[PDB]
Amino acid sequence: GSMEKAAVNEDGLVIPLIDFSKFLEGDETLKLETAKAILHGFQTAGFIYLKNIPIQPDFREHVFNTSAKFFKLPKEKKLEVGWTTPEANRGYSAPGIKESYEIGREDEPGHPNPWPAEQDDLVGFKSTMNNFFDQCKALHIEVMRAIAVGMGIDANYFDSFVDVGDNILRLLHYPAVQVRAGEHTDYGSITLLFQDSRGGLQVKSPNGQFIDATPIENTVVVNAGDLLARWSNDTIKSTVHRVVEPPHPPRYSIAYFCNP
Ligand SMILES: [Ca+2]
């Protein structure tokens, strides 16, 4: 743990809030302190919140606006960049309640991203999304480094595996307008979640009930997946969680799935 007040504290579930700039910019003592706090969170709750990440608030907001413009496209323009292969994991997915658009790295042979035609206010969609993908990738690399530093192994231990950039950026939109059997653990190393003000995410407590992951402004939610638990011989938890309709208006979220 560190100086900040928990993001979630309920029913024995404690999800910490950590100032990530203290890992990136602090001296060796402060860096280690923050890294261990990050590891501690993944070892107990399997979830943490980060603040003061290098991804700036104004860029996040622009990216959310850009996502909104994409989803306002007519249906056929979105189907024209439709999802293809499971190995691809790229493109638009229509409902079948909610819709999504998935972007991967630009240089995977035989699996290019299906980019929409850019006219009017969609001009800059591609450059914006590739930017955000790269910044999410850098953040993924740094979070794995915090885990390594926290464990007391070499900071760069995970770099080779995350440097391939084998990640998916997923834009989600729930048009206006409770779920069960959406309960799951993620498959990959870590997942970054940028949630809008309305929330919807719930994480299981050690006792066994689902607590709301209350949205906090300019914060990113990070959780470990099964692959990280595996790498750690189950010292790090891949915690069960689910998304739920909150207690009416349209909802947006952005997630970055690392090594899915
Ligand atoms: Ca999940």
Short mmCIF file of C-alpha atoms and ligand atoms in Angstrom, two decimals:
data_model
loop_
_atom_site.label_atom_id
_atom_site.label_comp_id
_atom_site.label_asym_id
_atom_site.label_seq_id
_atom_site.Cartn_x
_atom_site.Cartn_y
_atom_site.Cartn_z
CA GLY A 1 0.00 0.00 0.00
CA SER A 2 0.82 3.70 -0.39
CA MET A 3 -0.39 7.17 0.70
CA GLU A 4 -3.61 7.33 -1.35
CA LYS A 5 -7.12 6.40 -0.18
CA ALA A 6 -8.48 3.13 -1.60
CA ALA A 7 -10.57 3.38 -4.79
CA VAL A 8 -12.81 0.57 -3.56
CA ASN A 9 -13.07 -0.61 0.04
CA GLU A 10 -16.06 -2.88 0.71
CA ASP A 11 -16.79 -6.43 1.91
CA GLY A 12 -13.06 -7.19 2.32
CA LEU A 13 -12.33 -6.06 -1.26
CA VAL A 14 -9.64 -3.37 -1.30
CA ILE A 15 -8.66 -1.93 -4.69
CA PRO A 16 -5.89 0.64 -4.22
CA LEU A 17 -5.43 3.95 -6.03
CA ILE A 18 -1.81 4.52 -7.02
CA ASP A 19 -0.07 7.61 -8.41
CA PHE A 20 1.80 6.06 -11.34
CA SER A 21 4.02 9.13 -11.84
CA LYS A 22 5.83 8.13 -8.63
CA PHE A 23 6.95 4.93 -10.35
CA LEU A 24 7.96 6.67 -13.58
CA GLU A 25 9.59 9.80 -12.06
CA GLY A 26 10.43 9.12 -8.38
CA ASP A 27 13.84 8.17 -6.97
CA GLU A 28 14.79 4.52 -6.39
CA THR A 29 13.16 4.45 -2.93
CA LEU A 30 9.87 6.00 -4.08
CA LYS A 31 9.87 3.89 -7.27
CA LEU A 32 10.23 0.66 -5.27
CA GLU A 33 7.57 1.75 -2.80
CA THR A 34 5.07 2.38 -5.61
CA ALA A 35 6.01 -0.82 -7.49
CA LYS A 36 5.44 -2.92 -4.36
CA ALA A 37 2.09 -1.19 -3.80
CA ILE A 38 1.16 -2.10 -7.40
CA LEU A 39 2.22 -5.72 -6.90
CA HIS A 40 0.40 -5.90 -3.55
CA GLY A 41 -2.81 -4.85 -5.29
CA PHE A 42 -2.45 -7.56 -7.93
CA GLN A 43 -1.63 -10.15 -5.24
CA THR A 44 -4.68 -9.38 -3.08
CA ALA A 45 -7.50 -7.86 -5.18
CA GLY A 46 -6.13 -8.58 -8.68
CA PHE A 47 -7.29 -5.04 -9.56
CA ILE A 48 -5.79 -1.57 -9.09
CA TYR A 49 -6.63 1.98 -10.15
CA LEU A 50 -3.86 4.18 -11.53
CA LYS A 51 -3.83 8.00 -11.63
CA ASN A 52 -1.37 10.48 -13.14
CA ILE A 53 -0.56 8.15 -16.02
CA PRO A 54 1.36 9.54 -19.04
CA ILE A 55 -1.83 9.44 -21.16
CA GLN A 56 -3.13 12.99 -20.77
CA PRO A 57 -6.79 13.76 -19.85
CA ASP A 58 -7.32 15.95 -22.93
CA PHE A 59 -6.10 13.16 -25.22
CA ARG A 60 -8.35 10.61 -23.49
CA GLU A 61 -11.33 12.94 -23.99
CA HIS A 62 -10.47 13.48 -27.67
CA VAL A 63 -10.20 9.69 -28.12
CA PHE A 64 -13.63 9.20 -26.53
CA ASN A 65 -15.04 11.88 -28.86
CA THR A 66 -13.40 10.16 -31.83
CA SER A 67 -14.98 6.85 -30.76
CA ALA A 68 -18.41 8.56 -30.57
CA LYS A 69 -18.02 9.83 -34.14
CA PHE A 70 -17.14 6.36 -35.38
CA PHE A 71 -20.20 4.78 -33.79
CA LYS A 72 -22.48 7.50 -35.26
CA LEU A 73 -21.51 6.33 -38.77
CA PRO A 74 -24.36 4.69 -40.70
CA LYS A 75 -24.57 0.92 -40.12
CA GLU A 76 -23.20 -0.10 -43.53
CA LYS A 77 -20.07 2.05 -43.16
CA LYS A 78 -19.32 0.16 -39.94
CA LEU A 79 -20.11 -3.28 -41.46
CA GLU A 80 -17.65 -2.37 -44.23
CA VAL A 81 -14.91 -2.56 -41.56
CA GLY A 82 -16.49 -5.65 -40.02
CA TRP A 83 -14.76 -8.20 -37.80
CA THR A 84 -13.23 -11.05 -39.83
CA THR A 85 -11.20 -13.88 -38.21
CA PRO A 86 -10.79 -14.99 -34.57
CA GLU A 87 -7.01 -14.97 -35.15
CA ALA A 88 -7.46 -11.43 -36.53
CA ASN A 89 -9.58 -9.99 -33.70
CA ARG A 90 -10.00 -6.76 -35.65
CA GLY A 91 -12.90 -4.66 -36.87
CA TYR A 92 -16.48 -3.80 -36.09
CA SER A 93 -18.90 -6.08 -34.22
CA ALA A 94 -22.61 -5.26 -34.43
CA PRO A 95 -25.09 -6.15 -31.67
CA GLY A 96 -25.47 -9.95 -31.69
CA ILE A 97 -27.65 -4.18 -27.10
CA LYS A 98 -24.07 -2.98 -27.80
CA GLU A 99 -21.42 -2.55 -30.50
CA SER A 100 -17.60 -2.61 -30.64
CA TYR A 101 -14.58 -1.78 -32.77
CA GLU A 102 -11.24 -3.53 -32.32
CA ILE A 103 -7.80 -2.39 -33.40
CA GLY A 104 -4.55 -4.37 -33.15
CA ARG A 105 -0.95 -3.60 -34.04
CA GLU A 106 -0.31 -2.34 -37.59
CA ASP A 107 2.47 -4.79 -38.59
CA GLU A 108 1.05 -8.30 -38.05
CA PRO A 109 1.45 -10.14 -41.37
CA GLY A 110 -1.83 -11.24 -42.96
CA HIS A 111 -3.99 -9.41 -40.40
CA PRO A 112 -4.28 -5.69 -41.19
CA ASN A 113 -6.65 -3.36 -39.34
CA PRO A 114 -9.83 -2.52 -41.28
CA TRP A 115 -9.79 1.29 -41.21
CA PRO A 116 -12.98 3.24 -42.05
CA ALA A 117 -13.11 5.74 -44.92
CA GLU A 118 -12.33 9.18 -43.52
CA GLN A 119 -14.62 12.03 -44.62
CA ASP A 120 -15.67 15.23 -42.81
CA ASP A 121 -15.26 14.95 -39.01
CA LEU A 122 -13.94 11.36 -39.10
CA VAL A 123 -10.71 12.71 -40.66
CA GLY A 124 -7.93 11.76 -38.21
CA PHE A 125 -9.60 8.57 -36.88
CA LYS A 126 -6.72 6.28 -37.85
CA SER A 127 -3.87 8.54 -36.71
CA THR A 128 -5.68 9.17 -33.41
CA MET A 129 -6.35 5.47 -32.71
CA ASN A 130 -2.82 4.38 -33.64
CA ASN A 131 -1.49 7.08 -31.29
CA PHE A 132 -3.68 5.89 -28.44
CA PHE A 133 -2.73 2.24 -29.15
CA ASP A 134 0.98 3.08 -28.93
CA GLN A 135 0.48 5.02 -25.66
CA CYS A 136 -1.55 2.17 -24.15
CA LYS A 137 1.22 -0.19 -25.25
CA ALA A 138 3.85 1.97 -23.51
CA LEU A 139 1.69 1.98 -20.37
CA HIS A 140 1.39 -1.84 -20.56
CA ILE A 141 5.19 -2.13 -20.74
CA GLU A 142 5.57 0.15 -17.69
CA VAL A 143 2.97 -1.67 -15.58
CA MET A 144 4.75 -5.01 -16.21
CA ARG A 145 7.98 -3.26 -15.20
CA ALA A 146 6.36 -2.14 -11.96
CA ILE A 147 5.36 -5.74 -11.30
CA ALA A 148 8.97 -6.88 -11.91
CA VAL A 149 10.48 -4.12 -9.75
CA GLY A 150 7.91 -4.93 -7.04
CA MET A 151 8.88 -8.61 -7.16
CA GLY A 152 12.55 -7.68 -6.91
CA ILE A 153 13.51 -9.11 -10.33
CA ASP A 154 15.06 -7.20 -13.26
CA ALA A 155 12.81 -4.30 -14.33
CA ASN A 156 13.01 -5.29 -18.02
CA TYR A 157 12.18 -8.98 -17.53
CA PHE A 158 8.83 -8.84 -19.36
CA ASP A 159 9.88 -6.37 -22.10
CA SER A 160 10.47 -9.03 -24.81
CA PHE A 161 6.94 -10.48 -24.46
CA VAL A 162 5.08 -7.19 -24.35
CA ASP A 163 7.25 -5.51 -27.00
CA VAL A 164 5.66 -7.64 -29.74
CA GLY A 165 2.66 -5.34 -29.11
CA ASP A 166 0.22 -8.24 -29.41
CA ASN A 167 -2.65 -6.25 -27.97
CA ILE A 168 -6.19 -5.26 -28.83
CA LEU A 169 -7.65 -1.79 -28.36
CA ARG A 170 -11.44 -2.15 -28.00
CA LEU A 171 -13.92 0.72 -28.33
CA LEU A 172 -17.34 -0.02 -26.80
CA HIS A 173 -20.63 1.84 -27.23
CA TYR A 174 -23.92 1.01 -25.49
CA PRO A 175 -26.67 2.93 -27.27
CA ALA A 176 -29.54 4.24 -25.13
CA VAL A 177 -30.94 1.72 -24.45
CA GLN A 178 -28.19 -6.04 -14.61
CA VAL A 179 -26.47 -9.07 -16.16
CA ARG A 180 -25.52 -12.54 -14.90
CA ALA A 181 -23.26 -15.08 -16.64
CA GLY A 182 -21.11 -12.14 -17.79
CA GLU A 183 -18.91 -13.27 -14.89
CA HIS A 184 -15.39 -14.07 -16.07
CA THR A 185 -11.65 -13.71 -15.62
CA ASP A 186 -9.59 -12.19 -18.42
CA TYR A 187 -7.24 -14.38 -20.45
CA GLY A 188 -4.17 -12.16 -20.96
CA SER A 189 -1.50 -10.43 -18.89
CA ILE A 190 -3.24 -7.20 -17.95
CA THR A 191 -6.26 -5.26 -19.11
CA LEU A 192 -6.51 -1.46 -19.09
CA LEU A 193 -10.05 -0.07 -18.71
CA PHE A 194 -11.06 3.54 -19.34
CA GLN A 195 -14.66 3.79 -18.11
CA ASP A 196 -17.06 6.71 -18.54
CA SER A 197 -18.74 8.42 -15.56
CA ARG A 198 -21.66 5.94 -15.44
CA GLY A 199 -19.56 2.83 -14.69
CA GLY A 200 -20.95 -0.72 -14.70
CA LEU A 201 -17.95 -2.87 -13.72
CA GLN A 202 -18.22 -5.20 -10.71
CA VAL A 203 -15.48 -7.23 -9.01
CA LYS A 204 -16.08 -10.26 -6.76
CA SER A 205 -15.04 -9.91 -3.11
CA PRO A 206 -13.14 -12.64 -1.24
CA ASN A 207 -16.44 -13.33 0.57
CA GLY A 208 -18.13 -13.73 -2.83
CA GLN A 209 -20.39 -10.77 -3.71
CA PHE A 210 -19.96 -8.32 -6.59
CA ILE A 211 -18.86 -4.82 -5.56
CA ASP A 212 -19.14 -1.85 -7.91
CA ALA A 213 -15.87 -0.55 -9.35
CA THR A 214 -16.92 3.08 -8.88
CA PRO A 215 -15.61 5.33 -11.69
CA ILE A 216 -13.01 7.92 -10.68
CA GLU A 217 -12.11 10.77 -13.03
CA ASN A 218 -8.75 10.64 -14.87
CA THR A 219 -8.16 7.12 -13.61
CA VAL A 220 -7.50 3.83 -15.43
CA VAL A 221 -8.57 0.47 -14.01
CA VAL A 222 -5.98 -2.29 -14.34
CA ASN A 223 -6.47 -6.00 -13.66
CA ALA A 224 -4.37 -9.11 -14.05
CA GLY A 225 -5.53 -11.91 -16.35
CA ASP A 226 -4.99 -15.67 -16.28
CA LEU A 227 -1.69 -15.50 -18.18
CA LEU A 228 -0.15 -13.27 -15.48
CA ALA A 229 -1.48 -15.55 -12.74
CA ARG A 230 0.13 -18.44 -14.66
CA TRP A 231 3.47 -16.65 -15.10
CA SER A 232 3.41 -15.97 -11.34
CA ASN A 233 2.43 -19.54 -10.30
CA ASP A 234 -0.82 -18.14 -8.92
CA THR A 235 0.80 -15.57 -6.63
CA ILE A 236 -1.05 -12.90 -8.65
CA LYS A 237 -4.84 -13.18 -8.83
CA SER A 238 -6.91 -13.16 -11.99
CA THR A 239 -10.09 -12.00 -10.25
CA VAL A 240 -13.65 -12.77 -11.38
CA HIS A 241 -15.59 -9.70 -12.51
CA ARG A 242 -18.48 -8.60 -14.75
CA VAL A 243 -20.05 -5.59 -16.48
CA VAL A 244 -23.57 -4.50 -15.54
CA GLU A 245 -26.11 -1.82 -16.49
CA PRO A 246 -25.80 0.94 -13.86
CA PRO A 247 -28.66 2.08 -11.52
CA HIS A 248 -30.37 5.27 -19.30
CA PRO A 249 -28.14 7.53 -21.46
CA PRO A 250 -25.55 6.22 -23.96
CA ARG A 251 -22.40 4.65 -22.51
CA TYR A 252 -18.84 4.52 -23.83
CA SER A 253 -15.78 2.66 -22.61
CA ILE A 254 -12.33 1.84 -23.95
CA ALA A 255 -10.33 -1.23 -23.02
CA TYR A 256 -6.87 -2.44 -23.91
CA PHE A 257 -6.36 -6.19 -23.68
CA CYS A 258 -2.74 -7.13 -23.44
CA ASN A 259 -1.82 -10.57 -24.82
CA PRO A 260 -5.45 -11.76 -25.10
CA CA B 1 -12.95 -8.57 -18.27
#
